Amino acid sequence: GYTRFYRSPTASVTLSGLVNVKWDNEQMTMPLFKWIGGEQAEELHFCVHIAHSIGPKLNLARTLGTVNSNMDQHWAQAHRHSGATRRTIQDFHLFANDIPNFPDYIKIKLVPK
């Protein structure tokens, strides 16, 4: 399922045991990804799905682009394949914290391709 990635510059999470996530910078305009799953024979690809909190079709996951098992040396932006793929985090990706005054989060998960 989805992992909460909090909108706090120090937030960092791991997705599916394979991919570490952090913010690009302090304005938190997008997440960055690094493969931490160790060596793969063939290159493996994953869609990074993201939930919407408001607006149309809330049960439909959107995509940030793809990450792969070769993004293992440097932090990477998701690789975008459509012009429709949002590059930056928007208000419609944000969920209010369970506890008032603590940060919002986005919901992201890896989907094998």
UniProtKB/TrEMBL annotation:
<protein>
    <submittedName>
        <fullName>AvrL567-D</fullName>
    </submittedName>
</protein>
<keyword id="KW-0732">Signal</keyword>
